[model samples]
Target: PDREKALELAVAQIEKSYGKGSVMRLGDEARQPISVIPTGSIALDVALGIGGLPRGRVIEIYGPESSGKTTVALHAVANAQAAGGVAAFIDAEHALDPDYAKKLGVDTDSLLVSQPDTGEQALEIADMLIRSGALDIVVIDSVAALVPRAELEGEHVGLQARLMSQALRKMTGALNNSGTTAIFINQLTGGKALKFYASVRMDVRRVETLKDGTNAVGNRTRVKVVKNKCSPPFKQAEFDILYGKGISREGSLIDMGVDQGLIRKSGAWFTYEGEQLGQGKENARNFLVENADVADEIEKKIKEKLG
Candidate 1:
């Protein structure tokens, strides 16, 4: 219906000139696509296949403890701020770690944060944020932790879903129309509401534990697109979320370079541009680490391969 109803008399002049359903072809339609929010990882963006997370849609980033949900979610927020877009995080579970957010490159200076009293208030705050037509990406940290005021007041229990049905039901449309990409971080759950409303449901998990010396320094997360309405589902991507560094741009670059034959990974050694990067991936890590000018140029071709 949207395919036709939007054209109506707007197509009258075209129909007469070209005669009968001239606008049906849609070759020159001014329907510019919404901008994509790149999650600070080129490999993840490339694997997503539509550049990155689509605007005007709901995305559910669900995973267990120590997974990459918050890490990746913060990456999006950081990236949005870099692009001069308004960003907000509704801390439904309460207290956001500013240190982690700051390390992830989120500009806490202008970013908005809220600890809503109830789940409904969280959604209402989201509604208000998007309706102002200013917010670019809104992160609602963990839907599972959302509380209904009824349950909190010991007045009524089991109203979480009932409340969600009404809240998300109204906010979903507004979320899309206002051009805000809402990221709902949560655990595995079922039923409608955001589940039914979700345009993309991604599962982030810590597939590998990264170690620096004897200490656990990072996590190698596998982000699987469990359900993607905007693109192909079952697409998988991975990122190394360093404890203090967030996603490792250097690591992703080396991985992709080796995969695309831009970097040669022969046994334990890897080489780029026919020169020794290092004995192990660490050497290559330092290779890019040592020089910003050359590393930036090397990343350019890898991105070309990504495209």
Candidate 2:
């Protein structure tokens, strides 16, 4: 409306009430360029468009119990550590297995884990951590486990969901210009507030069954980015989840490679880059895992082609 003077007064008033960093101008020094770390899966990284979850924003990963939500969150934590960033796990559910997490590449020695007794306690910790700007990634190993104190005392009269909205306002606002990101793992219900605050929200689902008969240690799923504020949404990546291995980079790459024509398969003959990488699909996965250089080349191609 061409009210430049009014804009300045409004901005100053808000800053005085909510700190100077509360207000940000577009294309100004206040905003830092968003950088991403791979989710440890090439297909996932490609699907995300900016490599992986955007730092400085809230993220939500939800699915059913068998959807690998926790596993995928741990994978992101591990990757965050690998990038020389401090990581923290707000174990709201108190179900973290250090051994399994270690196997998934999480540096358990340096990773900080906190188990809060109540939902408010958990959010308090997260609010402090994110605002302190000390952590690079904070994984609330599930918002679903964020049980309000009232609920534990025998009730949930909309206070749980109400807490979610408040948490998002405080947590997401604190993360506005910082490099820290918060990951909220949830079940397939409630917490509609996250859908609004999360810059990237992914849904993990078991698309196909286990290929190795009835007894299998792992299965494959599709990680779909349902909401994205920074990139095109509704894209998905396919990958495998093993009990001890977490997320598989090779499997994601190989699977997508086939669809993208970078990896071809004919009657169990798997080929990559004009050469036979392996015989079967399993073998192809092994090849990519062993030849990470090849995987890198394929990833480059995949990134270029997709984005």
Candidate 3:
């Protein structure tokens, strides 16, 4: 019985150092795969490696204007809704359009939209929502818009960043084992770099300018996996955002298919699978829709390349 006594002594010591029930035996530890909500893009999911955004983790996506940061986050929300989960978007910039969000496949009826006046209020609301176990994902749109309560009251001098930093730190602890995913969207500063407590940090870069002469079209964006604790860093994927179509992989898929000889383009003409495909974006998108099997195969190839 000396071994049993030794075990009891060990347990007592652990409890003394870490408090009651703070330690678990190896066999009692949770060993299941982390739950992730897919982002609805095959290339992005492959690059992410964890299948999508990790549950019970904080993710940050930062980019310049028109870089498609909100679009990407909405993809995650759509996927969460598809999986019978609820999502909420905290609109700090007051730029949330329900019609646009619906077009992106988000379930408007199920999504909870809230606009907070100050950073303190936003975090408190987020904490309450998370603890309620009603939401699976929460998106804070544009952290750059958050005004700290102290700053608003003129009580602290230049404490906006510090308030933000501290708020994130406290929120991070609140997320442990909560089975909720929080996505924070931030704007790229003009010359300053800031960091927060995030498990995954992605940066969206606008690579190509889609334009019709002087008229502005959309952007071809490149999402870089900057600081991913769950996957390899610097993993990148490209997708396009159209004026009215939301986020589309058709352009990137067409580009990849052309590169792989699955689709051929000569000057203004395009062909796929020995059939004459039309020219321009709409025609290409129609072609993909008409030939779903071919499109799936092309998407599979793209995912393979991402891997």
Candidate 4:
């Protein structure tokens, strides 16, 4: 009798959770509208469903380690916060860099950083922030690291994965309740068969064929977006982050957003052609900066040059 009651309750809970005939029936209330917001990336945004990051939606920035996952996440965070809205971040793995956040113009003083250990704790904290009425953008530093692992359990992985999905739904829904954006970072690894076979075709980035291949650009920071909630994930982009110097002695500070992925030196001026001169190719970068005004001129020049 107890088991029967529990099963019934579970079914009811799932129904209520997913809004099955509860919030909207087949021909009842108005349909839920899709809300879109600019994702700060031009072509990348277009590829992602022809709209922008869905407001109050949980978008996953999943990729391998050192793949600029956190960098991209911070970029999104900075962009949202710069729009005069509040932003909060739950740093689960303590891998967040203060300097990078500073460079991206993320007001660390204004942003809320919660360091939660367990997966449940992290989700609880996120929910708390969403309900706090203080944030417009909330970011979970990672999903894989915080997800709870069960001990002495069978099929626990599936249960935890489901919990992660539900947590994202709840957090995003809550944030959307007040109109905000939530981004979750996820980690990935190759399939099991790749471990045994040396010739398995995988999306590995490197120029040399070593036991572990070497990078062509010496960029150990190769990353690929595996999943995105707003748009279809892609393999590449004109990705770059700004850099700044940390002044421990503290006198004056300088800020520069460059195209190269190099750290800045204190009191030294630097620049990147990609950021300042702009990438010449049309599709290389967004055509909004200097390109917007001279677009027609450029097209005419290209035609004349060809002639």
Candidate 5:
């Protein structure tokens, strides 16, 4: 047989055996073999090289108030819900706002929030939630409030902190026994130079924003990736919380079932502030269209990480 005919015969035989959709080739890059955890924020996850956050692992998020720490956590919850998994949030500091969560696209009915004060209470609630085998993610908002103020520093505090970290490990195991990601939110001490291993730890700082028509004072949050579990680390990223329907980064909004155009009496985003666009029409699509290249770049990073 000639060269072309021989090649054609070989290809035809292989196709007949394996079928068109079969992924049985020796070097089939199209098949995604490994799993990576996805960051709930699609845009942010792209930066982290995503599957989402690592499945059956721990992600530590530490930052000051409104630095998108809790916002990211809530977004993770929303992501989990979208993936058909439930989430458990243990509000150890009792700081969760129902309205805020509602705006983040979380299924309020599917989400279980435990308002626990003491450390033991938090642990108990966490254990109960995990053992129930009904959640895909569980969040411990922060350990700062639970850790004693007197033991904030020193070698003893360090030892206790390590122990607490171990306790968290155990809880993560429990979560993973049923395939859940346990997320712990930490509050930054701000003076810290560096810290130990966590899948991810971010230090957030405030940046100035354009307020009203003038350059009024506003808080723009920027996150520096301090620790990471994956390769191709990300540089510091600055994002703004557009007080409209959902949160946005660089003016590209991620819709959260809220109305962006409507301004509350206090001048903020709420259902009363605007109306949901008609079916098949959403502000997210518009936002995504405007930032398509950036979004595509993120997806590329994610695919690389998976590889």
Candidate 6:
């Protein structure tokens, strides 16, 4: 009389077609850990929550000029290659340097470097690469420089925004199962807003400059997590960038561990259990060498912070 039997039968059919638990309880999916590609810097990884950038996600790194956006992206590329995965650098800005990337640990010999003449063309290549499921990570350097095909042909000058939106809409779905980590390098607009399609967004703000005696040297940056769909947002981490060395040792694993309370520092020595871990930076390296379990514990807490 209640019509419950037919409802049950319909529900069964729907579940059967879509696979059991396709629609799940909140706790069910949350238990499954997301895969990530380590950024090669432990401090940066810990700041990112998952110890890396989540695969199958679109990450937009944006900031002012020479704010080290491309530098961070290259570190990810190097890490991906180090993990036995192929990488692609979509040089939309046409500023890719193989030797420099190699110094950062990217295997340029095995990397796919594409320099598309126009924004639309760049999008086409990116779409193909993402859907192919071949590359583990792809970095598009400076999306601002990607000129729309129409713009290149003397058409509407403001067509880039529309083209970018369209390209992102099309690629978002392919990224879901492609197991590829796509890093989009974008610029800070003067008056307009940033493209809102990225799953994660980082703002690299240059804070200061690191110098040696009289010679002008590296730059210090405050990387702010503006948006992170996977984890909590609005987090910040400060690190430095040397022109040749990438993110410098200012915010190293030891320093971050201390800041996060994973490691205890007393006076000139760092300790774990009444045991002197080490003193200076060299001693810090020694501590990690002699206390792998402690190091692992620090890494464990870093991931735990995400949950």
Q: Give the alpha-carbon lDDT of every model.
A: 0.78, 0.80, 0.74, 0.48, 0.56, 0.73
Tens digit of per-residue lDDT, candidate 2, span 48-133: 76777888888989998879888888888888899888898898776788999999999999988788998989989988888888
TM-score of each: 0.83, 0.83, 0.75, 0.54, 0.62, 0.78
Model 1 lDDT per residue over 210-256, tens place:
88788988878888887765555667888788887788877787887
- Candidate 4 residues 1-307, lDDT tens each? 6898987777678657854322212222222235444343332333343334556555656556655566656656766777777778887688877866785557888788888866767788888877887667778776656646352232223555556655655665577686666666666621221122111011212222112134222132223333332233443333232223211100100011222132132323332322332333222223333354443333333223322
- For candidate 1, the lDDT comes to 0.78
**Which candidate number has the best lDDT?**
2
- Cα lDDT for residue 68, candidate 4: 53
Per-residue alpha-carbon lDDT of model 5 for 19-92, expressed as tens digits? 43222333333322154444444445544543346656567777766566777777778778877888888876
Clash pairs detected, candidate 2: none
lDDT of 3: 0.74
Q: Write the per-residue lDDT of candidate 6 for residues 103-126, one digit (tens) a residue.
A: 777788999988898878887898
Candidate 5 Cα misplacement greater than 4 A, ranges: 1-41, 147-163, 189-197, 210-219, 249-307
Clashing pairs in 1: none
lDDT of 3 at 28: 37
Pairwise lDDT winner, candidates 1 and 4: 1
The Cα error of candidate 2 at residue 91, in Å, is 1.3
How far does residue 293 in candidate 2 sit from its true spot (Å)?
Answer: 2.3
- Give the runs in model 3 whose Cα sits over 4 Å from its true position: 1-34, 189-196, 212-216, 255-282, 291-307
Cα lDDT over the full model 4: 0.48
